[PDB]
Amino acid sequence: STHTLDLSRELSEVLGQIFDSQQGCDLSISVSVQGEDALGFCGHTIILTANLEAQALWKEPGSNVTMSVDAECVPMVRDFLRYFYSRRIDIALSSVKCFHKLASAYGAKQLQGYCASLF
Amino acid sequence: TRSTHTLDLSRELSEVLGQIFDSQQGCDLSISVSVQGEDALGFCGHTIILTANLEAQALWKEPGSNVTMSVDAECVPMVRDFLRYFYSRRIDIALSSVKCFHKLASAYGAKQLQGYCASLFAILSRDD
């Protein structure tokens, strides 16, 4: 007889909130838009290296990664990076075009396959 | 705005986080398990994962810190599964371990585990 306790349902948002806080980072993500560095974010190598979707972000702790995105796709970058942590993403008609561009350019094969089927 | 398509691959996360602890690589916390004074067994933690869990409140320390855990000689085999529970957020408890797992949770602020173990003996009050 073995009685199991499971509180693992929270883990999707638990990991998502680690990215939201932007504290204890060991990776710097710069978002260059129209030449100049428009936005900035940070990552946690320990969480990122565990996900095959975040293969583009599999770098040495302390490395600076430069993300070049279209001016149209600037609001969809935060959700895209959070998807590597949370492993959950909500896609609408207006964002399926931009999310497919990001997944193709940054090796998020599962997301790329999902966006392609939504057309 | 009327149609939203959601992708969810978050089911893996219980074991994904559990395997991070299993590997014992890329640690930024040293956990020394002492039994009757002298050091018996050693482990390592990841502050980023541990600080996210309220159960691991005892392990909420600066990256690089050395944490000492003073446990009973009987509760030594339950130490590895107790620390993994902070990562995986899942634990398998038996009749022989429910006594030890309640001692660990009470002494190291794992309130959810302490509450679960206490409710279990109302069921295990009998032999089998």
Author numbering:
A (entry chain A): 129 to 247
B (entry chain B): 127 to 254
Can you provide the manuscript's text about this entry?
The cellular glycoprotein LGALS3BP (galectin 3 binding protein, also known as 90K) is a secreted antiviral protein that has been identified by us and others to interfere with late steps of human immunodeficiency virus type 1 (HIV-1) biogenesis, resulting in poor infectivity of released virions. 90K is composed of a scavenger receptor cysteine rich-like domain of known structure, a BTB (broad-complex, tramtrack, and bric-à-brac)/POZ (poxvirus and zinc finger) domain, an IVR (intervening region) domain, and a C-terminal part without substantial homology to known protein domains. The resulting atomic models revealed tightly intertwined homodimers with the canonical BTB/POZ homodimer fold, consisting of both α-helices and β-sheets. As expected from the sequence alignment, the two BTB/POZ domains are structurally conserved, with a DALI score of 22.6 and root mean square deviations (RMSD) of <0.6 Å for pairwise comparisons of 119 structurally equivalent Cα atoms.
Among primate 90K proteins, rhesus macaque 90K is unique in its inability to diminish the particle infectivity of the tested HIV-1 strain and in its low potency against SIVmac and SIVsmm strains, despite 89-to-97% amino acid identity with active primate 90K proteins. A minimal version of 90K from rhesus macaques, expressing solely domains 2 and 3 [rhe 90K(127–408)] was inactive, whereas its human counterpart showed strong antiviral activity. Interestingly, introduction of V142A, but not L268V, into the short version of rhesus macaque 90K-myc resulted in a gain of antiviral activity that was in the same range as the short human version, and coincided with reduced gp120 incorporation. Since the individual BTB/POZ domains of both the human and rhesus macaque 90K proteins do not feature a similar oligomerization tendency, and given that a single amino acid exchange in the BTB/POZ domain of the short version of rhesus macaque 90K was sufficient to restore antiviral activity, we determined the structures of the individual BTB/POZ domains from the human and rhesus macaque 90K proteins. We expressed modified 90K BTB/POZ domains that contained three additional residues at the N terminus (aa 124 to 250; based on secondary structure predictions and comparisons with available structures of other BTB/POZ domains) in Drosophila melanogaster S2 cells and purified both proteins, which behaved as a single oligomeric species in solution, to homogeneity. We obtained crystals of the human protein that diffracted to 2.1 Å (crystallographic statistics are listed in Table 1) and crystals of the rhesus macaque protein diffracting to 3.3 Å. The human 90K BTB/POZ domain structure was subsequently used as a search model to determine the structure of the rhesus macaque ortholog by the molecular replacement method. The human and rhesus macaque structures contained 1 and 3 homodimers per asymmetric unit, respectively.
